[PDB]
Design an enzyme around this catalytic site. Structure first.
Site, PDB file in Angstrom:
ATOM      1  N   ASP A 163       8.370   1.489  -6.966  1.00  0.00           N
ATOM      2  CA  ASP A 163       8.434   1.367  -5.508  1.00  0.00           C
ATOM      3  C   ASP A 163       7.162   1.884  -4.859  1.00  0.00           C
ATOM      4  OD1 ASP A 163      10.314   0.772  -3.161  1.00  0.00           O
ATOM      5  OD2 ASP A 163       9.841   2.869  -2.777  1.00  0.00           O
ATOM      6  N   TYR A 183       5.827   5.195   5.177  1.00  0.00           N
ATOM      7  CA  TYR A 183       5.796   3.893   5.851  1.00  0.00           C
ATOM      8  C   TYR A 183       5.074   3.948   7.203  1.00  0.00           C
ATOM      9  CZ  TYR A 183       9.215   2.280   2.461  1.00  0.00           C
ATOM     10  OH  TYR A 183       9.859   1.901   1.323  1.00  0.00           O
ATOM     11  N   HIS A 200      16.941  -3.399  -7.169  1.00  0.00           N
ATOM     12  CA  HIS A 200      15.741  -2.580  -6.987  1.00  0.00           C
ATOM     13  C   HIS A 200      15.576  -1.317  -7.868  1.00  0.00           C
ATOM     14  CE1 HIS A 200      12.344  -0.883  -4.769  1.00  0.00           C
ATOM     15  NE2 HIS A 200      13.013   0.253  -4.730  1.00  0.00           N
TER      16      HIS A 200
END
Length: 321
Positions: A104, A234, A299
């Site tokens: 990730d 982010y 994921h």
């Protein structure tokens, strides 16, 4: 021989590190919203086979302290690669090069480690997030917003405090449960005020890989830390885009293996499959070996398909001796 934990001064942080085994070092770099703990099955499997597995809690996560939660600018890709380089210097003093395995946002970090300092990395196993060639036209937050709109998780994470307030009445455990068990190939959406309602649930049996105890390990940590450190990664994407302009056209030159779950949202971003399979990826990463797609997996592959992931790591890294 239990997993051993220590604290290490690195790049202005007091970083928590878990470690198991002796032999050549493998550094494991977790993603969002995870911990060193996400690598638990791999650490055991590789330690048993003659490697030293090391997994830190990244800046802003778990028991790693010192990064200012109120300033997302300190969570830039340059800070994060700085942490990793410092960590290696601190804990792998006699290994010029180590193996790196990442998932990730960890894989995002690892790609940049390999760009900035290929001299430190022997070979790389990256999970879920493929190399992203920097788009000269705009940053990733804008790219994803143009495709998926304002409710897209990356967009909703942008304003400081907004997502944190959304999660506050829900509690860390429910947020983590919902995220960890998510299986739909659409990206996550967090419309303002809707909590977790826009996130569909898979049948329960499909998350039997996650025990309550495992879920509690994560929830206990995140109840304490909150999500700000994690979400700040982010929030730093816009500056990351500006800061990486020097590497336009640069290739990753480290031997690499990439693995992704069939239902992973990142894998369904428009153009991603094309990039990955039809040559673009191989052009930017010339020593990329054959790509692996795990059928029927989402994921969190290290936890959902631990044996398959552990074995893929082992078989790959054995090729270098």
């Amino acid at each position: 021989k239990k997993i051993e934990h220590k604290m290490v001064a690195v790049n202005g942080l007091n970083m928590h590190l878990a470690e198991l085994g002796e032999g050549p070092t493998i550094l494991f770099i977790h993603g969002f919203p995870e911990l060193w703990y996400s690598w638990r099955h791999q650490m055991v499997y590789l330690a048993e086979r003659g490697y030293r597995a090391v997994a830190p809690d990244l800046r802003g996560y778990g028991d790693t302290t010192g990064a200012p939660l109120n300033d997302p600018s300190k969570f830039s890709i340059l800070h994060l690669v700085g942490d990793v380089v410092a960590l290696l210097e601190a804990i792998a003093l006699n290994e010029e090069k180590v193996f790196v395995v990442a998932h990730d946002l960890g894989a995002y970090i690892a790609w940049h480690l390999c760009l900035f300092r290929p001299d430190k990395v022997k070979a790389l196993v990256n999970l879920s997030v493929h190399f992203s060639k920097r788009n000269p036209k705009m940053n990733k937050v804008e790219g994803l917003k143009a495709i998926y709109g304002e409710d897209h998780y990356v967009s909703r994470f942008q304003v400081p405090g907004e997502i944190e307030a959304e999660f506050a009445p829900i509690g860390a455990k429910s947020v983590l449960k919902k995220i960890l068990t998510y299986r739909d190939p659409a990206p996550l959406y967090f419309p303002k005020g809707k909590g977790l309602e826009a996130i569909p649930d898979a049948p329960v049996a499909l998350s039997s890989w996650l025990s309550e105890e495992e879920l509690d390990y994560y929830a206990n940590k995140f109840e304490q830390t909150g999500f700000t450190g994690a979400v700040n990664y982010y929030r730093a994407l816009p500056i990351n885009w500006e800061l990486t302009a020097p590497w336009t056209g640069a290739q990753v030159k480290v031997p690499t293996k990439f693995i992704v779950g069939e239902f992973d949202g990142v894998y369904h971003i428009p153009g991603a499959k094309e990039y990955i399979h039809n040559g673009g990826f191989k052009k930017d990463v010339p020593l990329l070996e054959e790509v692996v797609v795990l059928e029927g997996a989402a994921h969190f592959v290290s936890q959902e398909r631990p044996h398959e992931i552990s074995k893929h790591i082992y078989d790959f890294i054995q090729k270098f001796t």
